[PDB]
Design goal:
It is classed as toxin. Two copies of one chain form a homodimer. Chain A is α+β, with helices and mostly antiparallel strands and 110 residues long. Chain A is built from two helices and seven strands, in the order ββαβββββα. The N and C termini of chain A lie far apart (34 Å). At the A-B interface, strand 6 and helix 2 of A face strand 6 and helix 2 of B.
Chain lengths: 110, 111
Amino acid sequence: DYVPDAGHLVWLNFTPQAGHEQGGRRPALVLSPAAYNGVTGLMQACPVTSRAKGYPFEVTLPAHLGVSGVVLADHCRSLDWRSRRAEQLAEAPADVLAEVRGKLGSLLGM
Amino acid sequence: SDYVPDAGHLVWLNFTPQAGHEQGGRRPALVLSPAAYNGVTGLMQACPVTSRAKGYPFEVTLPAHLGVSGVVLADHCRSLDWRSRRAEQLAEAPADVLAEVRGKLGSLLGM
């Protein structure tokens, strides 16, 4: 049924991981469109952490929309969203998606 | 010793641990993020290389004589802990390969 789409927040298992890679079941912000995510069963998504630390790659989620925390834009990963049990949670606003893409784009050298 | 992956480097890397259809194994990786970030965080963004191409547009072919053969999977870019996954310097990709991977990955990410 549900295919994650760009700008969706989803519950996802970030375990398995290695080292300082984000782990845990937590919200993920999806960057790749559902057309890709549906044909491959993979997606690009960033993990969400509970507390702002003023880390340069943090993008705060508006608390009023009921998922609190910061997207770690630099922690974007190709993820098997079936294997990691993606579950629909919310939709982030356009401006959060654009700021995450801007910060990750800069990191990737685009 | 003191090697820090830099943008455009090809490194051998453990893509395991992974889940499901995610790329696994010990394979070459094309580094996209700069050493100034990679060194402070111990993370990097990099794409895996596979020696067996399927012939889809998000595959970027490596030129010969770099020490490994195959295609960069631009859509499989990930944040990786490069010390945990035992990054080892291998080669440097040409600027045109790095630009093509970034263009294609930017398409996937909605840049």
